[PDB]
Amino acid sequence: QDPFAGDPPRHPGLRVNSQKPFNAEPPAELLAERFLTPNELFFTRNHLPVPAVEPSSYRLRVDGPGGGTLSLSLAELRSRFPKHEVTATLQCAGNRRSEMSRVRPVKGLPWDIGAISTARWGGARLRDVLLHAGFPEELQGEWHVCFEGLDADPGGAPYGASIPYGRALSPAADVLLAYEMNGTELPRDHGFPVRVVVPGVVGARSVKWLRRVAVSPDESPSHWQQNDNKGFSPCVDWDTVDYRTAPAIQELPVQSAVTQPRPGAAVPPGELTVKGYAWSGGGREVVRVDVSLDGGRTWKVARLMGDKAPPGRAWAWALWELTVPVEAGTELEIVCKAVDSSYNVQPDSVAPIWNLMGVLSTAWHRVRVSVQD
Amino acid sequence: QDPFAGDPPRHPGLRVNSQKPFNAEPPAELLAERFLTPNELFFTRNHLPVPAVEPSSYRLRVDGPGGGTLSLSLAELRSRFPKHEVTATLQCAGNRRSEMSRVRPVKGLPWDIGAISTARWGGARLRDVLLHAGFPEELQGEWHVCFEGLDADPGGAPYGASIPYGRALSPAADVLLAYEMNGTELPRDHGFPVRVVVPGVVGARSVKWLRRVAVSPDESPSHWQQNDNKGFSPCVDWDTVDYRTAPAIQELPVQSAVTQPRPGAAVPPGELTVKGYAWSGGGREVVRVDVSLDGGRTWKVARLMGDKAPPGRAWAWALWELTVPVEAGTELEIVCKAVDSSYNVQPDSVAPIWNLMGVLSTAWHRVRVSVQD
Numbered sequence: 001q002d003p004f005a006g007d008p009p010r011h012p013g014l015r016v017n018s019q020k021p022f023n024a025e026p027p028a029e030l031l032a033e034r035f036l037t038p039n040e041l042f043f044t045r046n047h048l049p050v051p052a053v054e055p056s057s058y059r060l061r062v063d064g065p066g067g068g069t070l071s072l073s074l075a076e077l078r079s080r081f082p083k084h085e086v087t088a089t090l091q092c093a094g095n096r097r098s099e100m101s102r103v104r105p106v107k108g109l110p111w112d113i114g115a116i117s118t119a120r121w122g123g124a125r126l127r128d129v130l131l132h133a134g135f136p137e138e139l140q141g142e143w144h145v146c147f148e149g150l151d152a153d154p155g156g157a158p159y160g161a162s163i164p165y166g167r168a169l170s171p172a173a174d175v176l177l178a179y180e181m182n183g184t185e186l187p188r189d190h191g192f193p194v195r196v197v198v199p200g201v202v203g204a205r206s207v208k209w210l211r212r213v214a215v216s217p218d219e220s221p222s223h224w225q226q227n228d229n230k231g232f233s234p235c236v237d238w239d240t241v242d243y244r245t246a247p248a249i250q251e252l253p254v255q256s257a258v259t260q261p262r263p264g265a266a267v268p269p270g271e272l273t274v275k276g277y278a279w280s281g282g283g284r285e286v287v288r289v290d291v292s293l294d295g296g297r298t299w300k301v302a303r304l305m306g307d308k309a310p311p312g313r314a315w316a317w318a319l320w321e322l323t324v325p326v327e328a329g330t331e332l333e334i335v336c337k338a339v340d341s342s343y344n345v346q347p348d349s350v351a352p353i354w355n356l357m358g359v360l361s362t363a364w365h366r367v368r369v370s371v372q373d
Numbered sequence: 374q375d376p377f378a379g380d381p382p383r384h385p386g387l388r389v390n391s392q393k394p395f396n397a398e399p400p401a402e403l404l405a406e407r408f409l410t411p412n413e414l415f416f417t418r419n420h421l422p423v424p425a426v427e428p429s430s431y432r433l434r435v436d437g438p439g440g441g442t443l444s445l446s447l448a449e450l451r452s453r454f455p456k457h458e459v460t461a462t463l464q465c466a467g468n469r470r471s472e473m474s475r476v477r478p479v480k481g482l483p484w485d486i487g488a489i490s491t492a493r494w495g496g497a498r499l500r501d502v503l504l505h506a507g508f509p510e511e512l513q514g515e516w517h518v519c520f521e522g523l524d525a526d527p528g529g530a531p532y533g534a535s536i537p538y539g540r541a542l543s544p545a546a547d548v549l550l551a552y553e554m555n556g557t558e559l560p561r562d563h564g565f566p567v568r569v570v571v572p573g574v575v576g577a578r579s580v581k582w583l584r585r586v587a588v589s590p591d592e593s594p595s596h597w598q599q600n601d602n603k604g605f606s607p608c609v610d611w612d613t614v615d616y617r618t619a620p621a622i623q624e625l626p627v628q629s630a631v632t633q634p635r636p637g638a639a640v641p642p643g644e645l646t647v648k649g650y651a652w653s654g655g656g657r658e659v660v661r662v663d664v665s666l667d668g669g670r671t672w673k674v675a676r677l678m679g680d681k682a683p684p685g686r687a688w689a690w691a692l693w694e695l696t697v698p699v700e701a702g703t704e705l706e707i708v709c710k711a712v713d714s715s716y717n718v719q720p721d722s723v724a725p726i727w728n729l730m731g732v733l734s735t736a737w738h739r740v741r742v743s744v745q746d
């Protein structure tokens with residue numbers, strides 16, 4: 001009996017890197033076509049079989065401050081708390097892992113530039129759910145909100161992750177228990193019926209198929225939170241790694257990639273429209289994207305599309321374009337790099353940011369194309 | 374009559390880049406000797422003559438919500454609000470400007486690696502001063518707290534800067550109206566009797582010789598806030614610059630430099646202790662410093678000294694060291710790079726981050742030395 005037999009069907013055009021469990025990204029030519037990634041193209045990252053959930057018997061378990069347990073149905077989650085909408089980009093820590101393997105092979109799913117997508121999410125504020133359970137605005141010291149998914153190891157251990165309590169309770173942090181995605185109910189692959197969405201934070205923490213929410217003095221003790229998605233020095237390998245030396249990724253650094261044109265393409269002479277995305281963690285706005293055609297020697301400023309968000313709440317990626325003249329029979333190396341609102345920047349090369357897990361791959365994206373005659 | 378005749382005397386050992394107005398950094402061999410920079414060595418950045426202030430007639434003007442003005446004496450500032458202490462690093466946007474001129478000359482003071490220092494500051498919380506003036510915890514929309522110094526242009530325009538209202542009112546942001554520095558009253562060069570200290574934010578906003586605090590729907594309209602300390606694309610020069618296209622620097626990106634040994638030094642064979650500082654903006658902790666001896670090809674992890682701060686409140690730099698073996702008659706190129714709590718990193722080279730103002734210089738610091746026989 002195959003544990004994945006009950007997995008949902010998917011859109012045919014996806015770049016699949018794993019069938020069981022299912023991991024896929026949209027083609028790069030469609031990735032940044034729209035500001036909001038259609039649900040069918042939104043990248044999918046699963047560690048386990050997809051839970052099959054009967055909507056009416058579903059209960060979200062929320063542990064209260066004193067040890068008691070609140071049990072919430074989907075209907076109650078919909079009706080008791082004012083629905084809030086947050087447009088937010090999820091990026092996997094493993095995004096662009098494949099460029100890291102080009103330096104030296106790494107463990108992990110070989111993501112290209114598409115382990116990132118954007119949706120308008122709708123649901124209960126996590127803040128409101130915790131206050132209803134009885135928690136105060138503020139706990140003394142460093143507390144965490146731990147989540148468990150309905151998906152578990154063969155031995156019983158569920159997918160688990162956590163965020164700091166401060167972020168959970170913050171109105172401005174926009175943390176949702178989402179049951180809607182781009183205006184329709186959550187797809188199975190994306191957490192039906194309920195997922196956490198943590199804006200400005202690595203995808204790992206946005207726990208799908210939510211079964212439990214608990215408040216703890218410690219972060220999630222799940223092996224996913226303890227052993228994955230941490231960043232190490234380039235000198236560290238599997239025989240020397242000590243998971244305690246690096247913190248769980250929460251906010252991600254500034255990131256950008258070229259979606260148009262594609263590597264190895266032949267483009268017509270005259271004008272070329274270069275397109276891509278840019279994004280940064282922690283609600284930090286993209287203030288600028290620089291684009292080079294000559295391998296990063298000279299730069300021009302891209303046009304940033306779409307609308308400004310409030311300060312500290314730039315949860316959604318900025319899409320960018322730049323139309324440039326191109327000469328017949330030349331070689332272009334197209335490079336992009338982004339600058340965020342704290343003026344963080346992307347580093348020149350991959351090797352100095354290499355790590356055994358292939359996470360945190362934010363060096364300049366480089367695309368080599370030729371111009372036709 | 375010389376406008377600077379009344380300026381305070383300074384410690385003899387400083388690397389002075391401007392006498393009038395006075396701008397100087399501590400020697401690099403003393404810069405990171407102590408976690409807390411002695412007041413006499415703390416870097417000094419003045420745009421103007423230093424105000425001469427009679428303590429007893431000094432009044433801080435605070436505009437209230439409705440148009441009225443609260444006037445505070447130094448004694449009242451000391452007695453009415455509970456003294457709070459914040460250890461915080463100030464870094465000038467112009468820090469390491471000189472490395473940028475090596476690519477292509479820039480305007481600005483030619484700072485080396487020392488336009489940064491750390492002190493334990495003591496004073497009134499700005500939060501408490503604003504609440505006492507009558508302001509609420511929260512204003513609707515994007516509001517700013519504008520500061521003016523006692524120092525002014527020959528034409529009358531005072532040094533001015535601002536921070537967002539949200540940061541001013543936040544308990545955790547630790548914004549002070551400081552009258553103490555490393556346990557003694559504020560030195561004249563450092564803002565006597567009162568300065569703003571804005572932790573995790575560029576030095577520009579920590580307004581010295583404070584005369585006025587006002588709340589505004591707009592940021593400071595001073596030419597310093599509008600025309601300086603903004604970051605542009607490397608393609609921008611003085612004939613194309615449009616100050617409206619880049620935001621005033623608030624939080625700074627991750628930064629680090631080698632203080633020991635010094636460029637061109639001859640060091641003994643056997644063991645070499647490399648020392649430096651690392652720091653990041655926005656209360657983001659330094660989670661790691663990587664050190665290279667071979668120009669950034671291979672890296673080792675430094676020891677981070679000193680104590681952990683609360684999450685999101687790492688206002689003070691991390692000092693680091695690494696003892697390595699060195700072979701007689703070899704050349705070393707010593708490189709350091711830091712990683713912060715959002716996993717932001719420093720870029721490889723200066724040219725791609727070059728800008729006409731020479732600000733935001735955070736590429737890897739490189740120090741070339743030789744090992745004796």
Ligand SMILES: Nc1nc2c(c(=O)[nH]1)N[C@H]1C(S)=C(S)[C@@H](COP(=O)(O)O)O[C@H]1N2
Nearest residue numbers: 043044045047092149159203204206207208
């Ligand atoms: N229950 C559960 N939640 C989960 C995962 C999972 O395997 N199980 N994967 C996580 C990781 S690592 C990522 S990157 C995001 C991806 O979400 P998406 O599939 O909606 O893009 O979901 C996170 N939430």
Ligand SMILES: Nc1nc2c(c(=O)[nH]1)N[C@H]1C(S)=C(S)[C@@H](COP(=O)(O)O)O[C@H]1N2
Nearest residue numbers: 416417418420465522532576577579580581
């Ligand atoms: N009134 C006033 N405040 C000021 C300045 C100034 O010229 N006048 N310089 C600013 C800048 S650009 C910097 S980097 C810091 C430096 O503070 P320090 O001299 O205590 O290091 O002060 C800031 N506050």
Ligand SMILES: [Mo]
Nearest residue numbers: 092093203204
């Ligand atoms: Mo992920």
Ligand SMILES: [Mo]
Nearest residue numbers: 465466576577
């Ligand atoms: Mo400055």
